């Protein structure tokens, strides 16, 4: 419990990265979160949007 000032620096970087990485799962109004799905379902004129 004495080392809080260092442990907090590891924790804040893990909270940031495990949010940045987890945002890859978000759809943002597209047909899928995973890019290969769009490229394997649509021709490029539809896929670009």
């Amino acid at each position: 419990s004495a080392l809080g000032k260092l442990q907090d620096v590891v924790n804040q970087n893990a909270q940031a990265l495990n949010t940045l990485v987890k945002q890859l799962s978000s759809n943002f109004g597209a047909i899928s979160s995973v890019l290969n799905d769009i490229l394997s379902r649509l021709d490029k004129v539809e896929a670009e949007v």
Binding site: I31, S40, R41, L42, D43
Partner: protein
């Protein structure tokens, strides 16, 4: 079918060629959503319901 009593045909456990469909100029309309017809032939599906 009569349109309120609409037909549904299950398709499963089989192989198909959708270019046979999208090349067929007999179709007065042909449209696709969430998929492109020219890309259908690379896919597989859980079932299909026609």
């Amino acid at each position: 079918a009569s349109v309120y009593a609409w037909n549904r045909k299950r398709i499963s456990n089989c192989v198909a060629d959708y270019s046979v469909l999208y090349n067929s100029a007999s179709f007065s309309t042909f449209k696709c959503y969430g998929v492109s017809p020219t890309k259908l032939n690379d896919l597989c599906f859980t079932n299909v319901y026609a």
